[PDB]
Amino acid sequence: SESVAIIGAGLVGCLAALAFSKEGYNVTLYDFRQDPRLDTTKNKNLKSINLAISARGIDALKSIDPDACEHILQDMIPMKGRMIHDLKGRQESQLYGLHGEAINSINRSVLNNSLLDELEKSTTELKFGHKLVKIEWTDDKQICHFAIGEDLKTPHTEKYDFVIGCDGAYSATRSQMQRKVEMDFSQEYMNLRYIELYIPPTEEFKPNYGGNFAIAPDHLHIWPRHKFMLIALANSDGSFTSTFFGSKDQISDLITSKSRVREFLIENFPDIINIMDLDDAVKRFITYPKESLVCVNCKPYDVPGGKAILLGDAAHAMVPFYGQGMNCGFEDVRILMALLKKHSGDRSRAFTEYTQTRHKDLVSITELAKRNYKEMSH
Ligand SMILES: Cc1cc2nc3c(=O)[nH]c(=O)nc-3n(C[C@H](O)[C@H](O)[C@H](O)COP(=O)(O)OP(=O)(O)OC[C@H]3O[C@@H](n4cnc5c(N)ncnc54)[C@H](O)[C@@H]3O)c2cc1C
């Protein structure tokens, strides 16, 4: 009957809620955003249209609800390797070897909404429009303060036995913990910026691709260039979500004129005009929201009395593409629930061991992602 407040309803917070729901906790899930499932919610906070979910990501979901997981991952698209497109438009297929991990394309909106639908079926209370503003820590029940609704009111308070921060890279929960526990902490803002482009489905079925795909759906497509990159991952309807990645200065330098963007696109990626509308590409490029990307590390991840813990981007936000934040966050949840099961529900011991065993793995995954990016960008 122990109570837990889970701060943040992104991918990792929903998975965590589903996790704790099923173990028999009374879960309340909070997020300052409105419900993304609602027609009236205009900003769905989707950092990307699709994602590469790996074997670890998949397993973690499977270990929490195999029956729903089957239907949740129904329309994912398995990848067999990477397809490299050189400057001349030549394509080379590079299949996934004995060091590389296999991945699947899945739609972000569909995953996150489907998790919310499983939560709706569970005992979990969903509280949208609730912004965590403060935690009062005690040796029994932590006091959470929220503000509600626009000119944010005051959801008075509620008390919970413990708190899980899944509140993203800018975690309010994390700051509150820092006032209670000496936390080693770093934040590094990357030079990276990304822009989403669109490759439409073909008009006709393409028998050799098994759908209306302009290029091969079973490859992650990559156009590697000097300090920048284009990628494309298939969507269910035959389209591809394409993403351009480079330094902010390069991008800021390009978007000063539409013809400069266009010529840049034609000169690099010449095989893209056969499958993409250049004018729509130029407009997307110039107007796609500029988003800061921060990388963080924490130690420890927990407040000592088993009172709180940080999972997902709140704990270890990393470089996109070179790192896999969602997969790592899913793995976070799987690892924590096994530790709770192992210690018969003893939070104090479980959270403590999580920090002792997880930190070294995460320092490594996140440093490797930083290093792989650093090398590309220099
Ligand atoms: C372009 C791009 C591509 C990516 N591709 C992949 C990929 O292919 N594979 C992969 O594994 N990862 C990928 N990632 C990383 C992945 O998107 C993230 O790691 C993952 O979505 C983070 O999940 P989260 O639940 O921890 O955080 P978030 O998605 O940030 O969710 C946090 C939630 O907390 C809420 N919140 C914040 N503050 C408060 C507050 N004070 N009170 C209440 N709620 C609050 C926010 O509203 C938000 O909804 C990609 C990232 C980017 C940017």
Coordinates of all heavy atoms in Angstrom, one line a residue, residues 42-73:
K42 N -2.0 21.2 -27.9 CA -1.4 21.6 -29.2 C 0.1 21.2 -29.3 O 0.6 20.9 -30.4 CB -1.6 23.1 -29.4 CG -3.0 23.5 -29.9 CD -3.2 25.0 -30.0 CE -3.3 25.7 -28.6 NZ -4.6 25.5 -28.0
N43 N 0.8 21.3 -28.2 CA 2.2 20.9 -28.2 C 2.5 19.6 -27.5 O 2.4 19.5 -26.2 CB 3.1 22.0 -27.5 CG 3.3 23.2 -28.5 OD1 4.3 23.3 -29.1 ND2 2.3 24.1 -28.5
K44 N 2.7 18.6 -28.3 CA 2.9 17.2 -27.8 C 4.3 16.9 -27.2 O 4.6 15.8 -26.9 CB 2.6 16.2 -28.9 CG 1.4 16.6 -29.7 CD 0.1 16.3 -28.9 CE -1.1 16.2 -29.9 NZ -2.4 16.2 -29.1
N45 N 5.2 17.9 -27.2 CA 6.6 17.7 -26.7 C 7.2 16.5 -27.3 O 7.7 15.6 -26.5 CB 6.6 17.6 -25.2 CG 7.9 17.9 -24.6 OD1 8.6 18.8 -25.0 ND2 8.4 17.0 -23.6
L46 N 7.2 16.3 -28.6 CA 7.8 15.2 -29.2 C 9.2 15.7 -29.8 O 9.2 16.4 -30.8 CB 7.0 14.7 -30.4 CG 5.6 14.3 -30.1 CD1 4.7 14.0 -31.3 CD2 5.6 13.0 -29.2
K47 N 10.3 15.3 -29.1 CA 11.6 15.7 -29.6 C 12.0 15.0 -30.9 O 12.8 15.6 -31.6 CB 12.7 15.3 -28.5 CG 12.5 16.2 -27.2 CD 12.7 17.7 -27.5 CE 12.7 18.5 -26.3 NZ 11.5 19.2 -26.0
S48 N 11.3 13.9 -31.3 CA 11.5 13.3 -32.6 C 10.3 12.5 -32.9 O 9.6 12.0 -32.0 CB 12.7 12.4 -32.6 OG 12.5 11.3 -31.8
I49 N 10.0 12.3 -34.2 CA 8.8 11.5 -34.7 C 9.0 10.0 -34.4 O 8.0 9.4 -33.9 CB 8.6 11.7 -36.2 CG1 8.4 13.2 -36.6 CG2 7.4 10.9 -36.7 CD1 7.2 13.8 -35.9
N50 N 10.1 9.5 -34.7 CA 10.4 8.1 -34.3 C 11.7 7.9 -33.5 O 12.4 8.8 -33.3 CB 10.3 7.2 -35.6 CG 11.3 7.5 -36.6 OD1 12.3 8.2 -36.4 ND2 11.1 7.0 -37.9
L51 N 11.9 6.6 -33.1 CA 13.0 6.3 -32.3 C 13.5 5.0 -32.7 O 12.7 4.2 -33.3 CB 12.6 6.2 -30.8 CG 12.1 7.4 -30.1 CD1 10.7 7.1 -29.4 CD2 13.1 7.8 -29.0
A52 N 14.8 4.7 -32.4 CA 15.4 3.4 -32.5 C 15.3 2.7 -31.2 O 16.1 3.0 -30.3 CB 16.9 3.5 -33.0
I53 N 14.4 1.7 -31.0 CA 14.4 0.9 -29.8 C 15.2 -0.4 -30.1 O 15.1 -1.0 -31.1 CB 12.9 0.6 -29.4 CG1 12.9 -0.1 -28.0 CG2 12.2 -0.2 -30.4 CD1 11.6 -0.5 -27.5
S54 N 16.0 -0.7 -29.1 CA 16.9 -1.8 -29.2 C 16.4 -3.0 -28.5 O 15.3 -3.0 -27.9 CB 18.3 -1.4 -28.6 OG 18.2 -1.3 -27.2
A55 N 17.2 -4.1 -28.4 CA 16.9 -5.3 -27.7 C 16.7 -5.0 -26.2 O 15.8 -5.5 -25.6 CB 18.0 -6.3 -27.9
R56 N 17.6 -4.2 -25.6 CA 17.4 -3.9 -24.2 C 16.1 -3.1 -23.9 O 15.4 -3.4 -23.0 CB 18.6 -3.0 -23.7 CG 19.9 -3.7 -23.8 CD 20.9 -2.9 -22.9 NE 22.3 -3.4 -23.2 CZ 23.4 -2.8 -22.6 NH1 23.2 -1.9 -21.7 NH2 24.6 -3.3 -22.9
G57 N 15.9 -2.0 -24.7 CA 14.6 -1.3 -24.5 C 13.4 -2.2 -24.6 O 12.5 -2.1 -23.8
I58 N 13.4 -3.1 -25.5 CA 12.3 -4.1 -25.8 C 12.1 -5.0 -24.6 O 11.0 -5.2 -24.2 CB 12.5 -4.9 -27.1 CG1 12.4 -4.0 -28.3 CG2 11.4 -6.0 -27.2 CD1 12.6 -4.7 -29.6
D59 N 13.2 -5.6 -24.2 CA 13.2 -6.6 -23.1 C 12.6 -5.9 -21.8 O 11.8 -6.5 -21.1 CB 14.6 -7.1 -22.8 CG 15.1 -8.0 -23.8 OD1 14.3 -8.7 -24.4 OD2 16.4 -8.2 -23.9
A60 N 13.0 -4.7 -21.6 CA 12.6 -4.0 -20.4 C 11.1 -3.8 -20.4 O 10.4 -4.0 -19.3 CB 13.3 -2.7 -20.2
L61 N 10.5 -3.5 -21.5 CA 9.1 -3.4 -21.6 C 8.4 -4.8 -21.5 O 7.4 -4.9 -20.9 CB 8.7 -2.7 -23.0 CG 7.2 -2.7 -23.3 CD1 6.3 -2.2 -22.1 CD2 7.0 -1.8 -24.6
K62 N 9.1 -5.8 -22.0 CA 8.6 -7.1 -22.0 C 8.5 -7.7 -20.6 O 7.6 -8.5 -20.3 CB 9.4 -8.0 -22.9 CG 8.8 -9.3 -23.3 CD 9.4 -9.8 -24.6 CE 9.1 -8.9 -25.8 NZ 9.5 -9.4 -27.1
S63 N 9.4 -7.3 -19.7 CA 9.5 -7.8 -18.4 C 8.5 -7.1 -17.4 O 8.5 -7.4 -16.3 CB 10.9 -7.6 -17.8 OG 11.2 -6.2 -17.5
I64 N 7.8 -6.1 -18.0 CA 6.8 -5.4 -17.1 C 5.4 -5.7 -17.5 O 4.5 -5.8 -16.7 CB 7.1 -3.9 -17.1 CG1 8.4 -3.6 -16.4 CG2 6.0 -3.1 -16.5 CD1 9.0 -2.2 -16.7
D65 N 5.2 -6.0 -18.8 CA 3.8 -6.4 -19.3 C 3.9 -7.0 -20.7 O 3.7 -6.3 -21.7 CB 2.9 -5.2 -19.4 CG 1.4 -5.5 -19.6 OD1 1.1 -6.7 -19.9 OD2 0.6 -4.6 -19.4
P66 N 4.2 -8.3 -20.8 CA 4.4 -9.0 -22.0 C 3.2 -9.0 -23.0 O 3.4 -9.0 -24.2 CB 4.7 -10.5 -21.6 CG 5.1 -10.4 -20.2 CD 4.4 -9.2 -19.6
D67 N 2.0 -9.0 -22.4 CA 0.8 -9.0 -23.3 C 0.5 -7.7 -23.9 O 0.2 -7.7 -25.1 CB -0.4 -9.4 -22.4 CG -0.6 -10.9 -22.3 OD1 0.5 -11.6 -22.3 OD2 -1.7 -11.4 -22.1
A68 N 0.7 -6.6 -23.2 CA 0.6 -5.3 -23.8 C 1.7 -5.0 -24.7 O 1.6 -4.4 -25.8 CB 0.4 -4.2 -22.7
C69 N 2.9 -5.3 -24.2 CA 4.2 -5.1 -25.0 C 4.1 -5.7 -26.4 O 4.6 -5.1 -27.3 CB 5.4 -5.7 -24.2 SG 6.8 -6.2 -25.3
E70 N 3.5 -6.8 -26.5 CA 3.2 -7.4 -27.8 C 2.4 -6.5 -28.7 O 2.7 -6.3 -29.9 CB 2.4 -8.7 -27.7 CG 3.0 -9.9 -28.4 CD 2.6 -11.3 -27.7 OE1 1.4 -11.7 -27.9 OE2 3.4 -11.8 -26.9
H71 N 1.4 -5.9 -28.2 CA 0.5 -5.0 -28.9 C 1.1 -3.6 -29.0 O 0.8 -2.9 -30.0 CB -0.9 -5.0 -28.4 CG -1.5 -3.7 -28.0 ND1 -2.2 -2.9 -28.8 CD2 -1.4 -3.0 -26.8 CE1 -2.5 -1.8 -28.2 NE2 -2.1 -1.8 -27.0
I72 N 1.9 -3.2 -28.0 CA 2.5 -1.9 -28.0 C 3.6 -1.9 -29.2 O 3.7 -0.9 -29.9 CB 3.2 -1.6 -26.7 CG1 2.2 -1.4 -25.6 CG2 4.1 -0.4 -26.8 CD1 2.7 -1.5 -24.2
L73 N 4.3 -2.9 -29.3 CA 5.4 -3.0 -30.3 C 4.9 -3.7 -31.6 O 5.7 -4.3 -32.3 CB 6.6 -3.7 -29.8 CG 7.2 -3.4 -28.4 CD1 8.4 -4.2 -28.1 CD2 7.6 -1.9 -28.4

